From a paper:
We performed in vitro assembly reactions with recombinant proteins to determine whether the V337M substitution in tau (297–391) influences the rate of filament assembly when compared to wild-type tau (297–391). With V337M tau (297–391), thioflavin T (ThT) fluorescence started to increase after 90 min and reached a plateau at 180 min. With wild-type tau (297–391), ThT fluorescence began to rise after 200 min and plateaued at 300 min. The cryo-EM density at residue 337 is consistent with a methionine residue, demonstrating that this residue at position 337 can give rise to PHFs. It remains to be seen whether the formation of QHFs contributed to this effect. These findings suggest that substitution V337M has a direct effect on tau filament assembly and demonstrate the usefulness of V337M tau (297–391) for increasing filament formation in experimental studies.
Dominantly inherited mutations in MAPT, the microtubule-associated protein tau gene, give rise to cases of FTD and parkinsonism linked to chromosome 17. Here, we used cryo-electron microscopy to determine the structures of tau filaments from the brains of human MAPT mutants V337M and R406W. Both amino acid substitutions gave rise to tau filaments with the Alzheimer fold, which consisted of paired helical filaments in all V337M and R406W cases and of straight filaments in two V337M cases. V337 lies inside the ordered core of the Alzheimer fold, whereas R406 lies outside it.
Author numbering:
A (entry chain E), B (entry chain F), C (entry chain C), D (entry chain B), E (entry chain A), F (entry chain D): 306 to 379
Write the structure that this text describes.
C-alpha cells in the first residue's frame, strides 16, 4: 500500500494599483436597542449581541490565498 | 495498491487598476430594536443578534485564490 | 504501508501599490442600549454583548496566505 | 363722530388630560444634498435651504388663543 | 371726533395634565451636504442654510396667548 | 380730537402638571458638510450656515403671553 501526496503550486496571486485614495467613510449615527432575557448557551456557542460597528479597510494589496491539505488514512 | 496525487498549478490571478478612488460611504443612521426571550443554544451554534454595521472595503487588489485538497483512503 | 506527504509551495502572493492615502473615517456617533437578564453560559462559549467600535485598517500590503496541513493516521 | 370699541372676552380654552406618555420619536437617518448657484435675494426675503430637522413636542396643555384687534380711522 | 378703545379680556387659557412622561427622542443620524456659490443678499434678508437639528420640547403647560392691539389714526 | 386707549387685561394663562419626567433625548450623530463660495451680505442680513444642534427644553410651565400695543397718530 503506497500513497504519494506531491502537490505542486507555482501560482501567483498578484495586484498592481496606481494611486489608491480619496475614500470617505462617514455614516450618520446608528440607533440600537437590545434586550435579552434567558440565554442558556452550553456547548461550543459563538454569540454576538448588539454590535454597532464602523470599519474602513483599505489594503494596498489585499490578496488572499487559502490552501488546505488533508490526507486521512484508515 | 498505488495512488499518486500530483496536482500542478501554475495559474495567475492578476489585476491591474489605474487610479482607484473618490469613494464615499455615507449612510444615514439606522434604527434597530431587538428583543430575545428564551434562547437555548446547546451544540455548535453560531449566532448573531442585532448587528448595525457599516463597512468600507477598498482593496487595491483584492484577488482571492482558494484551493482545497482532500485525499481520503479507506 | 508507506505514506509520503511531500507538498511543494513556490507561490507568491504579491502586491504593488503607488500612493495609498487620503482616507477619512469620520462616522457620526452611535447610540446603543443593551440589557441582559439571565445568562447561563457553561461550556466553550464565546460571547460579545454591546460593541460600538470604529476601526480604520490601512495596511500598505495586507496580503494573507493561510495554509493548513493535516495528516491523520488510524 | 363717535366710535366705541368695547369687545368683551370671557372665554376659556381648556384641557384636561390624564396620563400623557409612552411616546417614541425614532426616525431612521435622512439623506439630503443641496446645491445653490446664484441667489440674489434683495428685499424682505425669508429663506430656508437644506433643513434636516427632528422635533418632538409634547406639551401637557398646548392650548393656543390668538386674538387680533385693529381699529383703523381715516 | 371721539374714539374710545376699551377692550376687555377676562379669558383663561388653561391646562391640567396628570403624569407627563416616558418620552424618547432617538433619531438615527442625518446626512446633509450643502454647497452655495454666489449669494448676494442685500436688504432685510433672513437666511438659513444647512440645518441638521434635533429638538425635544416637553413643556408641562405650554399654553400660548397672543394678543395684538393696533389703533391707527390719520 | 380725543383719543382714549384704555385696554384692560385680567386674563390668566395657567397650567397644572403632576409629575413631569422620564424624558430621553438620544439622537445618533449627524453628518453635515457645508461649502460657501462668494457671499456678499450687505444690509440687515441674518444668516445661519451649517447648524448641527441638539436641544432639550423641559419647562415645568412654559406658558407664553405676548401682547403688543401700537397707537400711531398722524
Amino acid at each position: 500500500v503506497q500513497i504519494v501526496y506531491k502537490p505542486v503550486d507555482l501560482s501567483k496571486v498578484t495586484s498592481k494599483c496606481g494611486s489608491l485614495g480619496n475614500i470617505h467613510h462617514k455614516p450618520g449615527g446608528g440607533q440600537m436597542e437590545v434586550k435579552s432575557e434567558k440565554l442558556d448557551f452550553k456547548d461550543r456557542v459563538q454569540s454576538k449581541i448588539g454590535s454597532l460597528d464602523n470599519i474602513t479597510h483599505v489594503p494596498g494589496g489585499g490578496n488572499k490565498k487559502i490552501e488546505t491539505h488533508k490526507l486521512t488514512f484508515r
